[PDB]
Write a protein that binds this ligand. Structure first.
Ligand SMILES: NCc1ccc(C(F)(F)F)cc1
Ligand SMILES: NCc1ccc(C(F)(F)F)cc1
Length: 330
């Protein structure tokens, strides 16, 4: 079987992408943030503290004839940005773009951090990293992808994120009309539970390509591109007036500047991020200082190929017994 769903940016800056997901019987449709950097499927629900819900669509397990409480199970997650949530666990039927899994663990939020409350357009997350990172206790639970794997025509999913436009998540098949050229595959390490891979280098604008190994994770759940300080300094040095701002928390640039492109290597192939993808607009309303889409990973401890990089490519998440990541231009 296969599944295919449209994913849509939540605002004009592509800060995140939401994809509709059917949960329960009869279906309750929630718009979830597909996150290859985490492994919990959690949702705003009728159990969430009422003061922490502000416009989100909630899952109501008591209205689903297929929902079953998972006795004694709980979950608690903290994300790298300091966001967090926690609650109890149901099992229920979950469908994505026609692809149905029965008995999927649906983690019902009882408490969420303020960053989720203030994001009225995100009803939850659907984790797509490896199941070893799932936070359900005492019995760890599998991801949607892991549960669907056996029934998929091919054990893959693909991410085709749009620049200021809708895109597609496909499960079980590779749409050969969605990319140009060939797909270049590269090795994945699962030792940390992430889709972790090694980029072969980078170039700034039309500059010389620098061959250097950059270990990082492919993370649809993170907005920006987080790279080592040396790389990021070389990028912003080519932008007149760009500087690192401690008060703002990263590199900013005069909004009137034109940004150079950024190229990263995948084996012998090259993915080019257009300069316009790196513009994240004024730091505050009316400001002539703009926030950069490439920032240092020095404070994070890991390099992150977030949406800024992934939306420049067609990305194959190959969940075969030896997993690999595939990148193609589009
Ligand atoms: N999108 C989930 C996520 C959040 C944080 C991290 C970090 F910062 F720990 F690498 C990775 C993945
Ligand atoms: N990396 C996971 C993640 C996804 C979304 C959010 C936000 F923006 F909704 F708070 C936080 C963390």
């Amino acid at each position: 079987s296969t599944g295919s769903a449209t994913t849509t940016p939540i605002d004009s800056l592509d800060d995140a992408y939401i994809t509709p997901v059917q949960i329960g019987t009869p279906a309750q449709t929630l718009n979830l943030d597909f996150d290859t950097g985490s492994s919990d499927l959690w949702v705003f629900s009728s159990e969430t503290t009422a003061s922490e819900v502000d416009g989100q669509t909630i899952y109501t397990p008591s209205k689903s004839t297929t929902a079953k409480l998972l006795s004694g199970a709980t979950w608690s997650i903290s994300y790298g940005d300091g966001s967090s949530s926690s609650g109890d666990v149901y099992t229920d039927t979950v469908s994505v773009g026609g692809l149905t899994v029965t008995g999927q663990a649906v983690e019902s939020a009882k408490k969420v951090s303020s960053s989720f409350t203030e994001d009225s357009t995100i009803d939850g997350l659907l984790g797509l990293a490896f199941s070893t990172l799932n936070t359900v206790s005492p019995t760890q639970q599998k991801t949607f992808f892991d549960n669907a794997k056996a029934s998929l025509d091919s054990p893959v999913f693909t991410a085709d994120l749009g620049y200021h436009a809708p895109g597609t998540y496909n499960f079980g098949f590779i749409d050969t009309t969605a990319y140009t050229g060939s797909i270049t595959y590269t090795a994945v390490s699962t030792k940390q539970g992430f889709w972790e891979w090694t980029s072969t280098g980078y170039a700034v604008g039309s500059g010389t390509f620098k061959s250097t190994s950059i270990d990082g994770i492919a993370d649809t759940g993170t907005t920006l591109l987080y790279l080592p300080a040396t790389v990021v300094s070389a990028y912003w040095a080519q932008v007149s007036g760009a500087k690192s701002s401690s008060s703002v928390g990263g590199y900013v640039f005069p909004c009137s500047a034109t940004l150079p492109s950024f190229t990263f290597g995948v084996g012998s192939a090259r993915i080019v991020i257009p300069g316009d993808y790196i513009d994240f607009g004024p730091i505050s309303t009316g400001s002539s200082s703009c926030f950069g889409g490439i920032q240092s990973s020095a404070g994070i401890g890991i390099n992150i190929f977030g949406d800024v990089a992934l939306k420049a490519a067609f990305v194959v998440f190959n969940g075969a017994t030896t997993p690999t990541l595939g990148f193609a231009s589009k």
